[PDB]
Structure formats: structure tokens, C-alpha cells
Scaffold this active site. Sequence first.
Site, mmCIF file in Angstrom:
data_model
loop_
_atom_site.group_PDB
_atom_site.id
_atom_site.type_symbol
_atom_site.label_atom_id
_atom_site.label_comp_id
_atom_site.label_asym_id
_atom_site.label_seq_id
_atom_site.Cartn_x
_atom_site.Cartn_y
_atom_site.Cartn_z
ATOM 1 N N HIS A 61 27.897 39.644 34.747
ATOM 2 C CA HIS A 61 28.968 39.992 35.676
ATOM 3 C C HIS A 61 28.701 41.406 36.217
ATOM 4 O O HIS A 61 28.726 42.383 35.466
ATOM 5 C CB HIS A 61 30.327 39.885 34.972
ATOM 6 C CG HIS A 61 31.498 40.212 35.855
ATOM 7 N ND1 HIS A 61 31.829 39.462 36.966
ATOM 8 C CD2 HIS A 61 32.440 41.187 35.765
ATOM 9 C CE1 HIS A 61 32.894 40.006 37.555
ATOM 10 N NE2 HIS A 61 33.288 41.055 36.845
ATOM 11 N N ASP A 63 29.838 44.201 38.843
ATOM 12 C CA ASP A 63 30.855 44.715 39.765
ATOM 13 C C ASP A 63 30.268 45.609 40.838
ATOM 14 O O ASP A 63 29.629 46.601 40.498
ATOM 15 C CB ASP A 63 31.876 45.536 38.984
ATOM 16 C CG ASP A 63 32.575 44.706 37.941
ATOM 17 O OD1 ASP A 63 33.316 43.748 38.284
ATOM 18 O OD2 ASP A 63 32.304 44.982 36.752
ATOM 19 N N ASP A 175 36.613 36.961 36.973
ATOM 20 C CA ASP A 175 37.275 38.256 36.759
ATOM 21 C C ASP A 175 38.490 38.626 37.626
ATOM 22 O O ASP A 175 39.196 39.543 37.229
ATOM 23 C CB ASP A 175 36.261 39.413 36.744
ATOM 24 C CG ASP A 175 36.689 40.592 35.836
ATOM 25 O OD1 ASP A 175 37.407 40.347 34.809
ATOM 26 O OD2 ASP A 175 36.287 41.767 36.118
ATOM 27 N N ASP A 312 29.536 41.743 31.055
ATOM 28 C CA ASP A 312 29.372 42.727 32.136
ATOM 29 C C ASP A 312 27.971 43.298 32.091
ATOM 30 O O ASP A 312 27.519 43.773 31.042
ATOM 31 C CB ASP A 312 30.371 43.873 31.976
ATOM 32 C CG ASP A 312 31.794 43.449 32.228
ATOM 33 O OD1 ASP A 312 32.041 42.226 32.416
ATOM 34 O OD2 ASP A 312 32.657 44.355 32.280
ATOM 35 N N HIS A 442 37.171 42.751 43.442
ATOM 36 C CA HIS A 442 38.340 42.827 42.571
ATOM 37 C C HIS A 442 38.551 44.198 41.889
ATOM 38 O O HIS A 442 39.504 44.322 41.127
ATOM 39 C CB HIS A 442 38.340 41.660 41.542
ATOM 40 C CG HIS A 442 37.122 41.638 40.655
ATOM 41 N ND1 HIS A 442 35.966 40.967 40.998
ATOM 42 C CD2 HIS A 442 36.869 42.235 39.453
ATOM 43 C CE1 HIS A 442 35.068 41.125 40.028
ATOM 44 N NE2 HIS A 442 35.584 41.899 39.085
#
Length: 1016
Positions: A61, A63, A175, A312, A442
Site C-alpha cells: 500500500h 500513499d 484504505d 504499507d 485518501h
Amino acid sequence: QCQDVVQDVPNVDVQMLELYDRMSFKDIDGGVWKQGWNIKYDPLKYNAHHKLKVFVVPHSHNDPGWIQTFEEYYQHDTKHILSNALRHLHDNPEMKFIWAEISYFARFYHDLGENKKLQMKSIVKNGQLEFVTGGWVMPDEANSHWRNVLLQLTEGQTWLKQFMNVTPTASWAIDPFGHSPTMPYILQKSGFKNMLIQRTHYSVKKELAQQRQLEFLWRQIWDNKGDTALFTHMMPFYSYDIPHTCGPDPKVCCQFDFKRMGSFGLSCPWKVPPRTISDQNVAARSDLLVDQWKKKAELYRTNVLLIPLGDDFRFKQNTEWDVQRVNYERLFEHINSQAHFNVQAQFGTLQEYFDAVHQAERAGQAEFPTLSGDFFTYADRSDNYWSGYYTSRPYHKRMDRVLMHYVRAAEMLSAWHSWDGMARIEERLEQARRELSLFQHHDGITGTAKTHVVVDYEQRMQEALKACQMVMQQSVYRLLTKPSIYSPDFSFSYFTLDDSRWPGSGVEDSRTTIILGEDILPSKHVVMHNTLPHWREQLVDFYVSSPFVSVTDLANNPVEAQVSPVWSWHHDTLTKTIHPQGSTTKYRIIFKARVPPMGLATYVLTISDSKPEHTSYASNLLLRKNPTSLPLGQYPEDVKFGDPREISLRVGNGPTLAFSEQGLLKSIQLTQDSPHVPVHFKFLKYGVRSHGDRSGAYLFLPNGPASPVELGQPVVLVTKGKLESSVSVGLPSVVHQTIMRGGAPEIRNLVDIGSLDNTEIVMRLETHIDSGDIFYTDLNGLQFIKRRRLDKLPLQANYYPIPSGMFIEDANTRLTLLTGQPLGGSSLASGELEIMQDRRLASDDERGLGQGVLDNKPVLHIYRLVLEKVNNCVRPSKLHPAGYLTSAAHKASQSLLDPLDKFIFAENEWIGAQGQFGGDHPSAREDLDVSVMRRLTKSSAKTQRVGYVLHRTNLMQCGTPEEHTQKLDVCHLLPNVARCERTTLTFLQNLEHLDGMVAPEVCPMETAAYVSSHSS
Ligand SMILES: O=C(C[C@H]1CC[C@@H](O)[C@@H]2[C@H](O)[C@H](O)CN12)c1ccccc1
Ligand SMILES: *[C@@H]1O[C@H](CO)[C@@H](O)[C@H](O)[C@H]1NC(C)=O
Ligand SMILES: [Zn+2]
């Protein structure tokens, strides 16, 4: 033909509002599965003829900004993850990996040497690396506008089609903080067949798991037939991390995260570490792992099991790839060779899982339930409801909506022509689309990033706004100059944009004054653009250096105008009051612009030595004890003073509004004879708990109901004009303004929470309306969903996203509040609406951000407030889960989100200027919008292609006779059409070749895309 979206209540197995009404939401200790129960299974369920098929799906994941910026993460983590994925998948043909965030992938791929690009294309083509969703980001689903969800999906998928030759049909959203049905709506109209979600309320996971309803056909709330349905998999447990994905017991699953043995600086909080798989332990380790899998499988209907394997920014180090892969390979070899398990386990991708599930379905193994509704407001544990991020960082939430509109307007204005590459149009538009798309993340629009990351998103968005302005103004100059005169310098600013509401008065002094004078410049051309596909009138204002200015159209017809002062509010640190000061050299001129559908209209502002015939001047009244003088230079009307008092105002034939002595609305009277309906604005404050969990960027944990803001004796300014009137008041933390132009008022709040730590400022409306426990809020600017206030849940659970509007109603009366920015809100008592303005929080709320929210800055929030009679409207039945706007409310929302654009000609003389563009464009029915117009080809393409996204909303029938409007056929908007195709919403797949090259209009609540091809 078209489905009726009002009168036919869909029959679904699970309707989320109904489920919410029945559920008790008890938070009991379920054992090792803390929010569930001790799962039991019959060991005899699986056997040689019926095996459990297990797909272990490695993932990482990533970001695009959160605790680090996009570029910081790319340099420190993501580029290594992707480089090592390329190597490891290349070298290990059975290993698999899924990837979601195309912003990162595109960055990485464009930096690769050609040899490695080719290796990368090979591991995608052979199915080892699989893209999931394929959007630029994994967007927020609460605050995001549907138009921007589509924009970012399209940005990522267009890149994937061009460079990787693939288009994902499975979505992965592990998420975002709660989930919206706008996602399956867009995805199903963009070729998708399956989607996966994770963050839903723990009580919802428990209820659906008990009924094996975690996989469902998710249709829209109004969809009777089910044509919108998309297969959806909801994950069952608290997290997507490895401890919460193998099965119900994280103490066991953590032992199968092989990155947690020590050398990587990670451990298992349940205090049992992973151990390397060996021949001496594999049978025991396998018996523990298979037991977890079979427990998880009890929650689902097929014999195909999804086991995500990731967390993550995982799969960075080479040693990490090895430790996960080698250990799982040993488990698979053992398990798959031991018949007594009756399991076949392997690395897989998301699409492989869904393909196998549907094979089982078709073999008659399972039938899936139908579901409608949403998954807000999320709570991950106890009373920790994630309604804070509906408001956090509201400056950037408002900026999102401004940039949304500027991207639309830039793409539309420039679509009319083909541009030479030297004009850098495609370059600037790509930059703007990508920065806006990035912010849909997000941790972007949600206001959940660290301070320096918020600054990065803001800088990116500013650059995007400048790019849009450049493209818009070049386009206007080309569209409105005689062709044989047009002589562009593609670096020159022919016009400057004038925006009255961004950043806004009291936020930034950014607007240019039009400087006129007998000894310098007698007149100035201005141009308005209307992105909507119907004729539109709207008041527009400009700053001018004299009050003696009149307006003409380009046929030299006088246009009625009003001049008002330029008022700025000052926090007087000497007198300790908040009060307005007037300019003695700048003034506001206001007039009604009338602009063709998707068109342009030119006006001229001319100075004179004295009051012009067609220009009037507002009166101004300052209400306060202890006034001092307020000179206004040449402004022909002297400011008047008085003690605070109640006042009433009416502009045109519109409503009459009454205000308290504090400058706050108290009543609205719709017509001459009609009643003065009580409608009271009030500002209140929520605080933070002094013990237990603290509110932060994500969580709203108020210390009880809100308390009134102590107002003192605030200064009130009343400006009364023929075209526009207003009441403005300087309250603590908010300059509150009610503006009247002849219809529903506009509300503007200049919100500066200053240094008020641990405070959330709310704006509430109090009315008589007998709404009970029902209210309506929108989802992503697309649809209105019925909400029921539940006193069995805490206050913060009753807060919902207000991405664009909310309303309450009874049998007779409705009050709708439309917004120009997403904020959080509720109806906490019958007859009330409330919406949070800003929040300043000293504490971190334990979701990884590692800071409070102490970076507030002044923001101008904008609204329209529509009181209406609805006794004559055809509404859905009491059991229908949707609601619908009226015409007036929908137009009010459009006035906030897609106002006219205003351009001021920069030079002294515009040679070859024209009066109008688009007078021949069809004026489409009011419920239809051209959400997107985008030229899809560069100038070198023999066959030009232009893409359109058409959206028809659904407005209530309330007895206003329909006037004839023109059919809008987007495929004939540009000349020389040679083909018209219906496409997916991303424009990436042709679905229908259209007869006669005519693009049909769409049904209520439907969205379609069309591409016209031109032989020109
Ligand atoms: O849920 C999260 C973090 C989740 C949800 C919030 C979101 O901001 C972040 C980032 O997007 C990360 O991807 C992980 N997310 C968490 C929970 C307990 C402790 C620490 C963190
Ligand atoms: C891309 O997709 C398919 C299958 O991978 C293949 O037939 C085609 O040749 C590939 N290349 C294209 C469409 O340029
Ligand atoms: Zn995340």
C-alpha cells in the site's frame, strides 16, 4: 425506456438504512477476533472432490503523500519497491504482485531504461504483476466529487492503456475511511466487473459476516432493475495488514508475516514472533495456518478464498521479497501435497480470485445477495467514528472544488480548436489534471496529511490553477478574435481571470482592479464564460478604480449596473472589535451577464466624469454602538450609522429576509402574502474530551453537544442595492455574510479559527420543519441519500459527509443548504441542519499521523440556502432510500460549483474583438450537464476525436410547466463529424457505433460518454 428513479422502491436483500435501523451496534469482546465471534467450521466440509482454493495476493500500500510528500516517498520507498518487484517477479515466475497507484507507477516507468521497460511490460503481459483499479490514486470516497473520482480514474487508466496495454476490471480500495456507492456507479460504467472494499464499521462487518453477505451485488439506491450492480467483496477484519488478513486470530496471523522476526525492525504485538519454515516445523505451522484459512472461509459462500499478503510500503528490500516468498513456497508445497488438508494454495492476483469466484457461482455453488446503500460513517473500534476528516483542512477542501471547475473550464474552452504543440495546451492540461487527481488521495482532500505534505498538495494545486488560467485565456482570445487578425503569443496573458470567491475577500488580495481614467484608459473589455450547456444569467462583479462606470454589451446596448464599496473586515487589536473598512479608491461594479450554452459573452466597462444613467449606487448602514466615520472617496452615497437593530431586506421579487440585531437570519418570507418562516442561523462550538480518546484529524470525539459562541455586540454592515443587497457581521472567528440577488440567498463565511485550540466551529440552522429523525445528504455531488439520526449511536456517528448539499423536509416545507466545499454535518434534532466550518485540534488521534491539526488558515466557505414549499412535489415513498433536489436547489448548487468565469482583457485595445461565442449551441434541458468536454487527439491526428461525459440528474416534479428546450447532440457540436461512438466513461473502450452520428441524451441519474470523430 428510462427507469423511474422516484416511484419504484428497489427490492434488495440488504438495504443499509434498514440494516442500520435494526442493528444494535453492541461492542462486545468477541475473543481473538475482537469484534466478531469464535468461528467454528466442519472439518468435513472440504474433501478430495471439494477442495478449498486459496489465493495469497502480495501487495504494497503506497500513499501518494501522507507522512512524507509524494516525491519523498518515491525516493525513499516506492522506487525501490518497484525496482525490486521488477527483479523478483522476473526471476521467480510463480510469484505475483498487485499494484494500485498509477501516479507512482508512471513516475517509475518513465525513469526506467528501455531494457527494463521491456522486462516490465513482460511481467504485466504474463500476469505476474497486475494493476488493480488503475487510478492515479486510491481516492477518498467521502469528500471527493464524482467528477474528480472519474478524472483520476481516467488519468491512471489512460496511462495504463498507452504504456502497458491493459485496462483493469477489478478495483482494490483497502484504505479510504468508509465507502461510497459512487464508486461502483463509476466503475460499472467504466468496464469494471468486480471491486473490493475494507474500511466499513466493525458492527457492519460482524452482521454481514454472520449472514455470509460480505460478497454482494452492489446496486444504486434508486435502481429497481439492477443494471448498475457491481460484484463487491468486503474484507471481514479490522485491517488489511497481514495479522488481519490470514484469518480471525491476529496473534496467529502475525506469525506468518515473515518481515517481523527482528532484523527489519518490526515485531508482533501479540508477543509470538514468526519462525522460519523448516521441514521440522512445516506440518505444525501448516496446521495453524490452514485452520485460520478455513475459519475465514466460513464467512464466505464459495470454496475460493482471498488472502491478501501486504501492508504499507511493503516489498521494499530484496531480503523482504525472499523472506516472504521462500517461507510461503514451503507452506504451499507441504499443504498442497497433504491430502488431509483438502487445500490448493498459491500466489495469485485479484482478478484470478474474482475469476475463480464467478466460476464457482456459475457451477451453481453460490448465489450472491443484492445490496444498496453506503458505508458511512466508519468506526474502526469502540466509539471512534471517523467524521472529523469530513472537515479537516477545509481551505484545501474548498480549493479542490475551485480547481475542479477550472480543470473543466480549461479542457472545455480549449477543446473547440486543435492547437499547435508550441502552444503547450496539452502540457498544461496534463499538469492540471494530474495535480487535481493526486489530491483525490485518501490523505489529500481528507486533510489527514502532515503539515508539510498539505503544503506540497497546495503548491501543486496552485500550479494547476495557473496552468488552467493560461489555457482558458489563450482559448478566449482565439474564440473571440477575428480569425485573419488573431496573432497569438502563446506565453502572453491576453486576459487575467477574476474570481470573486477564491481565495476570497479577507483571504488573499489577489484580484486586479480595472484602472480607468480620462488621462489613461477610457474603457475595458471583459468576457464571461458559461461552462453549462444552457443559456445562463448571473450577476458578476469587478473591481474598478472609479464609481462612475457604466456597462454595455458589444452591440453597445446599455446594461443596468450597481456600484457598491469594497469592504474589508479588520480585527482591530487596539479597539478589540471586528469592523469593516471601505476603500476610497476601489469600488465594485455589479451587472447581470447573459451567456450562451458552453459559450462566451463580451461586455465593456466605460468611465465617465459623473453618475452614468444606467448605474445605481448601494446604500450602506453600519450598525454598532460607538461608530466612527467611514469616508468612501468619490462614492456618491454617504454611509449611515445606527445602533444595532433588527432589519428586513428584499431584492427584486425574491424572498424577504429578516435578521436579528446580531446580523443573523431569523426568518424567510417567500412571497408578498406568505408567512415569515422561522429560519435561524446560529454559530456554536464543540470541544475535546479531557479524559479518554481525543479528537484529531480523523476522529470527531466531542465533549457533549455544542455550546453557543458568545457573540458580544457584533458590528453589522447592511448594504442595500437594486441588484444586490447584503448583511455582514463580524463574529468571533467568522465574518458571516448573507447576500441577496433576487432568489435564494448566498451565504459566505470567512472562517478564521485563529488560536482557538481544541475547538470545532459549527454553523447551525434552526427551523420549525417537522423532519423528526430524517435528513438527506449527498454522496460525491452525484446523489442524495436518506439519513436517519440514531440516538442509539453517539453524536459523532450521526455526522455524515456534506460534499455538496443537505436538506430536511416535512409534508409541506423543505430547507436545502448547498455547499461550495465538502464539510461534515448532521441534523441532531428535528428541524435542524448543521455543518462544521473548521476544527483546530491539539492532539494526535492515534491513526499514524503523529500530529494534531494546528495549521488552520482563513477560508471563505460559500453556500446557497433554499427554503421551498414541497407539498405539491412528487416525492419518493416513505420506504425509498433516495431523495432528489428541486430545480431551484439544483441550479443553486451549479451556481456554487460551476459559476461563470470572468476574464479582464490585459492590454489597452483588443483589435478584432467579437461579442459572443456559442450563440448557436443548443440550450439543453436543465437536468442535463456536459460534465466533461475533452479533445482526445493532438493536432497531428488526421481524425480528430472529442470526448464528452453527459450526466442527467433527477429533479422533482412540482407542477412547474416544462418549457421546450433543444435536444443536445454532443456529436454535432464540432463540425464535420464522421463517426459518433458511445464509450466507457474513461473514453478507453468503444461500446456502440451510433446511427446517424447522433449521441442520444441519457436517462435520469445516468451518465454516458461519447466520442465524436471529425474528418475536418
Ligand atoms: O489505520 C491506520 C492508518 C491508515 C488509515 C488512515 C490513513 O491516513 C493511513 C494512510 O493512508 C496509510 O496508508 C495507513 N492509513 C492506523 C491505525 C492504527 C495505528 C496507526 C495507523
Ligand atoms: C495488447 O493486447 C492484446 C492482448 O495482450 C494483444 O492482442 C495486442 O496485440 C496487444 N497490443 C496492442 C493492442 O497494441
Ligand atoms: Zn493509505
